[PDB]
């Protein structure tokens with residue numbers, strides 16, 4: 001069994017938009033890296049039913065790029081508002097110990113908010129990937145707007161997973177006015193604007209307890225005028241798509257890079273790509 005494995009994650013609050021043609025950039029494969037595990041999370045509208053019939057292009061296009069690099073799709077899960085797919089290189093899998101398992105958590109009677117957790121074991125180490133989705137208006141188990149539920153947190157099991165990732169738009173925003181936020185963006189004072197970000201507030205309320213976000217050096221990923229790099233200042237610029245990590249068992253998880261993908265500009269939010277090296 002290997003000393004270390006690499007994991008790439010991407011999430012995007014893509015809304016109504018279809019999957020795009022250059023997936024190598026999206027998955028962080030454009031400089032020839034070969035991650036052991038890839039997870040892709042989307043938030044948007046109407047996936048499961050699929051009235052635009054983009055399901056088949058999703059499958060066609062992802063399966064065509066990834067199967068020829070040695071990936072097996074462990075699971076794709078879709079709801080009306082979320083999608084989560086996890087891929088792993090074929091060479092790591094053993095059917096007798098993989099114990100591939102997904103749950104879906106619903107918090108409302110329309111099944112629009114909640115999350116997905118997909119877990120599996122390779123080399124006797126358990127990985128869990130979560131995505132989640134919450135509305136501002138929702139009544140919730142936390143009495144906050146944040147996309148946390150303890151059922152989605154596999155570090156709060158009696159037998160916590162070894163490597164945990166939570167990816168998606170957490171419904172965490174920047175709590176200041178648009179003018180001040182845009183001034184801090186224009187000055188590139190990322191840490192100054194992050195001071196107003198709600199993740200620390202969620203953690204003060206004991207949500208996302210013990211979860212770490214890699215250092216953010218990129219500008220807010222929302223809200224943009226589509227096809228441009230111009231902020232739509234009808235919303236305070238915020239960091240929407242996030243990647244969080246933790247270990248339940250004291251394993252080292254080292255972020256290598258964490259960045260927004262500004263070249264993908266076709267919508268209001270920009271995708272966020274994180275790359276990690278984990279030590280077994």
Ligand code: HEM
Pocket residue numbers: 014015016017018019020040042044045046047048049050051052053054055056058059060062063073076078083085
């Ligand atoms: C641009 C954002 C999107 C991304 C990144 C994305 C990503 C993915 C991924 C990675 C898969 C699994 C592919 C595989 O089989 O290996 C998938 C499946 C699927 N996607 Fe998307 N998707 C997007 C947009 C959409 C939209 C707008 C719809 C329509 C509502 C949609 C509908 C579906 C459906 C129905 C499946 C499952 C189809 C099947 O299992 O036959 N996707 N998507």
